[PDB]
Design a protein around this ligand. Structure first.
Ligand SMILES: Cc1cc2nc3c(=O)[nH]c(=O)nc-3n(C[C@H](O)[C@H](O)[C@H](O)COP(=O)(O)OP(=O)(O)OC[C@H]3O[C@@H](n4cnc5c(N)ncnc54)[C@H](O)[C@@H]3O)c2cc1C
Ligand SMILES: Cc1cc2nc3c(=O)[nH]c(=O)nc-3n(C[C@H](O)[C@H](O)[C@H](O)COP(=O)(O)OP(=O)(O)OC[C@H]3O[C@@H](n4cnc5c(N)ncnc54)[C@H](O)[C@@H]3O)c2cc1C
Ligand SMILES: Cc1cc2nc3c(=O)[nH]c(=O)nc-3n(C[C@H](O)[C@H](O)[C@H](O)COP(=O)(O)OP(=O)(O)OC[C@H]3O[C@@H](n4cnc5c(N)ncnc54)[C@H](O)[C@@H]3O)c2cc1C
Ligand SMILES: Cc1cc2nc3c(=O)[nH]c(=O)nc-3n(C[C@H](O)[C@H](O)[C@H](O)COP(=O)(O)OP(=O)(O)OC[C@H]3O[C@@H](n4cnc5c(N)ncnc54)[C@H](O)[C@@H]3O)c2cc1C
Ligand SMILES: CC(C)(COP(=O)(O)OP(=O)(O)OC[C@H]1O[C@@H](n2cnc3c(N)ncnc32)[C@H](O)[C@@H]1OP(=O)(O)O)[C@@H](O)C(=O)NCCC(=O)NCCSS
Lengths: 379, 375, 371, 379
């Protein structure tokens, strides 16, 4: 790693050990939003890593973001997803597709932890099938009028703004303030894990927003959504790496100190093998993530690469966390140790920002297009 | 299946649907012992299936037990482990190794739902390493004196008797201990990932005196009793794992038939079809292993390797099936509105208790090789 | 297991150890059809097991067949597939769908190892897509006229008769071999099961009598599908034999190979590999026997046959792989039988319906059970 | 990738396409050592990639070697192992541990494809247990006398020199082995019969039998008792070569399956229109790209003079298991055509299998990884 990125890593790891490890159990048990910690992170630049310093951000790159995301998620996975949604899914598309004015109004006040945003694509009847949005935007006067329900929205209860995708005929993106007349929140979902982040429906009933609330041009929405998810996928890959790293750390320390049949568990061959496979899966997932980050930072294509990273990391996080429980034994099954929380948090990384199935379809599609292109050059 | 085992399956299915399915979510949410339902199961003979009627049991066999155990656990996994501990781990060793008088005293009042037992082998410093028991039993006058802590005892807070293993020096012995009794305190209930309706806690013995006739079998038989008990228990846990797997698969199939994506049900996607075929294969395979082990036990044939195979297969299937059930549900899989996330949490214990998967592999390997050496 | 089935197991084991184990390497190395051993098997009844003794069969059941199949295949995988093709794919449909006269003409002469048969469904352009058959049968007078090429036909170069599927919409036909209008393609050069022959059947204006049709016109696809259900139990069992011999090999070796001061079997890792192998095999055998018993009791067994074949074939590949790994360097050379088991195992995931087709068949039945 | 490494990649691909692809079926079928092709590779620097130009080498690095190895092995797996043995196992130790005079005598004439070497560590009695060498070397006057059988020596029947490991001191149990440079032929050395192998059949494998074999005193590479260390550090490098070989086998297997799947029809469409086929292909691509990044990390650590034992073991482990899984799935996608020699898939499956065994089995790799993982946590 570069020197800068090494220092960043140490700052983030110190933060995580100081501020996140001591609350992780509480945040999870009580489904508690980590308010004070998100705000401190805001001051550190972690909620706006890839945002130009001129717009109020850290002025860093996606590799730095990937590194920071891992270290944060290692401390608290919920804190990780909150940070990832703000960077990749909220601020991301606004920097990419927004006017100078939209950036001033909707980026800058959301860079410091005073306000955060959210991303609303999924609906109760469709999440993988993104283009099947039934939520409608209709132009009427100096306004777009929004009607429908978005589902599963991370940060719904804490967000001051949302990038919302609505059918205009055919999908468009809109900047929506929160709260706003004609927008109500559903009840907070009761989740298996990442319990400190809020997840709730967004309910639009003749919600009016000004005409310049549209992000990009009408019909650009599906493309805005897909490109934003490419970036988001790197963030989720990093979160999954943090979850996996901390689960592995937990297994190693335990197994070194737990005695069985006369010696530490780490004298048993089978334990060494579990641990070696855990380390291989994690390091492999990490390199795929950094590849995808560096490609994005060099303005090269990264769709296949982000899908691979998210896929590899999420499945490693679930495998590794399972094996951490197994190595701990009975201690793995109770809330006295952190391993059972790891297994619970890990499990969402295979679902959100495109299920594993979707990721494979994306990779396959890009694989097959690349070979078809190479074939055509002959003709 | 025999006509009689078909009628049992239906009785159990009908009972789980009426009595367990409606309470499963609350039991899990509140960590709440299903006391009324256990008493009802007691009355149906389900807490003493392989006990002779003359001792107040159902007079059935281990095949019937595995079937009933699967149907119960399909309904509620916690009720499952509670039924299994009483049947296999508590009542089982007393039927196998007890005197006639011991069976009348310690089996018969635990055959009907009013009293249940527990099994206490594991300790804080040792669970897989069973023979490392540092709980001590010392002969003093008219009593055995017990000192030490047992850990992870399922049914600790509701149990009226325990089979406790303690070092007396072939250095371990098995003891019938009443609960409550002077010198015994319970630890705090464990806060578990799943099977939250079952209680789990430490048994703490300080100068705990029990009569000399409390010993089960002869002194030094303890390790053997424990190991042969776990063999029977493992068929019970395999059957619980099957029930968790079956209900997770039922959940995924009903959901996928009704959820639309890209114009049609999820079950029209080839990928989803493949998930469900793998799930069905793993489950049916595990069930046959389980039934093989039960039938061997029933015909008074060895079944150590076969019970370990069943427990290993079933339990790893439960975890794989329940994971895939969540995946098929999508977002709905990650929330308590659906039961998928509960099956995932419940399935996970089955790879740990009554011998970890690693312990299972070592047992299977040991018996494999003996079979080649005797050929 | 019944005592009758217990005795059959020992006869087949005895036979395999005397007649098959000593030639397995040669059969494989030289791609050599094991003609003398197949004749002896014919004399024992192994090539006509589920056939009534009135038609010269053994008069046994599919459970007996699956046991015998596993013992033969443990001895030599090519002898196993030759025997399975004759029992399940040739004689099977003729028994189930043929007339009295058809049985006497086409079964009775093929029950004793003098004459064996074959089953021709696949074509160069379609194997999984079995209904896509482009070979044609036209009715010209008191004959059928066949035109087209069938592909991958096991026993092609040794068979005296074939059950051939032709588009008429598909029908089944008994074709004698040799016959005017029929020629054989070159033998395939295979990764494994090299002692069985595999080749194309090429029909050019091939004329056969009108009474050659098996069942009614249009029944062909159903006859083919019901045949492959039976065949799948056979391949399951072939696969169990390969797997079993691979595991026998590994255990003997590991007990007697020293490393770091003890046998390999003293290493915890080797014990785990062995435990997983035994678990995969034993579970696959139970699925396989469930399918054979459902068939013997006239119960549906499509899904169960599919599960048995899928489980058994995937176990044969995983176990043979681990057999090579336990042997180390010795696993990679022809001095040991492990590399041959790896090569033989691999076909069982492909023929009689690929693993992917098995999963589709299983899923279809599963969903219908819930409807 | 640097422009230089991009040129090299194209050179090796072109060579492979021009010289290796057309001989691979024959080399495999007939167990034929591809001597003309190895000589040409020699002229291009491929047999001495990390050797300085001043000793007659290509003057490049291990990243270049890894890239070159993958392209060579894609064309012919046997040519790949022949090249890897010469680079990593023969030349490697001489460059790392040899004197100036040893480099001139034993490196320089083995850099051009006229003479290649071999590496003799394993014995009939022991491979994984490398330290149990019973072949002996006794100091007799001004000479060393060797007695014993080495087993499994790649290039045995074509080599003009060997790096040979022999027991020189059974009293000092951790300084027990020494390394020796031995010419081929030499009085006292005879070869065993060539092994009949599942795959990589163009390479020779056979026993080296020493009986009263006297070699001069300056034949010892490094100090007496250093042999086990020289051998282990040599295998660390070799593992990067073998990982690259395995990538090449996996890549050609994947190329094969994709071409077939796009062009084979079933149920009225190409196989690639089936989801399950797309899934098979996505998993293949992910396993390969992941293994490649692990390999490049290890090569890069070596080239930067950093520790790479764990990383080399991870790479060899990931690549070798990917090659076997990918080649297995290539056969499955071809269906019947996958089982016959008319297509190359069955050969890729046979070649891939060796990569899980030699230069330290998969089991040894996991023990190595676990050991270094644990040491990191302790430090
Ligand atoms: C805690 C949580 C937080 C979330 N955060 C956000 C957020 O902030 N903003 C937002 O917009 N959304 C968010 N999501 C939505 C999330 O991305 C979706 O749940 C996910 O995309 C899957 O969509 P779905 O739940 O509708 O499942 P479905 O689309 O019904 O999928 C069900 C199953 O079918 C599979 N499937 C679907 N299509 C195909 C296909 N073509 N081929 C093969 N298989 C297929 C899926 O992979 C899955 O296994 C969140 C969800 C959760 C649970
Ligand atoms: C909810 C719950 C209920 C339980 N019910 C009961 C009960 O009613 N009564 C009772 O006595 N106990 C009970 N158990 C205890 C249970 O059986 C043990 O947790 C289990 O045997 C593992 O023992 P351990 O927790 O001490 O883990 P450990 O023995 O510390 O093992 C930790 C890891 O090391 C591995 N390991 C251990 N030894 C070896 C070895 N030799 N080779 C390879 N790997 C090894 C294990 O497989 C595991 O992966 C229960 C546990 C729980 C969590
Ligand atoms: C040695 C050998 C012996 C054989 N014996 C006989 C014999 O005696 N008689 C006979 O008639 N045939 C025989 N077969 C043919 C064998 O059954 C076929 O190879 C098998 O059906 C696969 O068909 P295919 O080769 O045409 O491959 P394809 O049908 O082209 O399939 C290629 C790949 O696509 C997959 N695929 C195809 N359709 C689907 C789908 N809908 N969904 C998902 N995946 C799909 C396949 O599973 C496979 O993975 C033999 C083959 C061999 C190699
Ligand atoms: C074609 C070929 C080429 C080769 N090239 C060379 C060469 O050029 N020079 C050379 O010196 N050698 C060479 N080798 C030797 C190769 O590196 C060995 O085959 C390998 O190290 C395994 O050694 P073994 O065959 O003695 O197997 P064994 O050591 O007998 O092992 C057999 C099984 O036990 C396992 N095992 C052994 N020890 C342990 C342990 N402690 N824990 C867990 N599992 C263990 C192994 O993983 C393996 O699965 C070659 C081998 C082959 C087949
Ligand atoms: C052949 C194939 C494509 C079947 O799917 P498809 O072509 O769609 O055929 P189906 O959907 O079953 O429909 C055709 C009829 O065959 C019938 N059928 C299918 N399998 C049957 C079986 N096992 N028994 C009886 N009937 C069967 C179906 O019931 C169906 O009847 P209807 O038209 O009344 O609905 C595939 O699923 C399969 O099993 N292929 C076999 C591949 C194989 O084994 N190849 C190697 C053979 S030689 S080694």
């Amino acid at each position: 790693l570069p020197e800068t990125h090494q220092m960043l890593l140490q700052t983030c790891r110190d933060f995580a050990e100081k501020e996140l490890f001591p609350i992780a159990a509480q945040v999870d048990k009580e489904h508690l939003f980590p308010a004070a910690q998100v705000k401190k992170m805001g001051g550190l630049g972690l909620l706006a890593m890839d945002v130009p310093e001129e717009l109020g951000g850290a002025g860093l790159d996606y590799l730095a973001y990937a590194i920071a995301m891992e270290e944060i998620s290692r401390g608290c996975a919920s804190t990780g997803v909150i940070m990832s949604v703000n960077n990749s899914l909220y601020l991301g598309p606004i920097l990419k597709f927004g006017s100078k004015e939209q950036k001033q109004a909707w980026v800058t006040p959301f860079t410091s932890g005073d306000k955060i945003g959210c991303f609303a694509l999924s609906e109760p009847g469709n999440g993988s099938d993104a283009g099947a949005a039934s939520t409608t935007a209709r132009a009427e006067g100096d306004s777009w009028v929004l009607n429908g329900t978005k589902a599963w929205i991370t940060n719904a209860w804490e967000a001051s703004a949302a990038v919302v995708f609505a059918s205009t005929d055919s999908i468009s993106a809109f900047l929506v303030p929160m709260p706003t007349p004609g927008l109500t929140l559903g009840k907070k979902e009761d989740k298996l894990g990442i319990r400190g982040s809020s997840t709730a429906n967004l309910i639009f009933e003749d919600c009016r927003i000004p005409k310049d609330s549209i992000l990009g041009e009408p019909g650009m929405g599906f493309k805005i959504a897909m490109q934003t998810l490419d970036m988001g996928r790197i963030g989720i890959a990093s979160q999954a790496l943090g979850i996996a790293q901390t689960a592995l750390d937990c297994a190693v320390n335990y197994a070194e100190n737990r005695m069985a049949f006369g010696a530490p568990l780490t004298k048993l061959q089978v334990i060494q093998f579990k641990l070696a496979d855990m380390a291989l899966a994690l390091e492999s997932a990490r390199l795929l993530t950094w590849r995808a980050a560096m490609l994005k930072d060099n303005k090269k294509p990264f769709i296949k690469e982000a899908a691979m990273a998210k896929l590899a990391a999420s499945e490693a996080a679930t495998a590794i966390s399972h094996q951490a429980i197994q190595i701990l034994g009975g201690m793995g099954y109770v809330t006295e140790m952190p391993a059972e929380r790891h297994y619970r948090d890990a499990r969402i990384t295979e679902i959100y920002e495109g299920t594993s199935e979707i990721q494979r379809l994306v990779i396959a599609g890009h694989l097959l297009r690349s070979y078809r292109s190479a074939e055509n050059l002959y003709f």
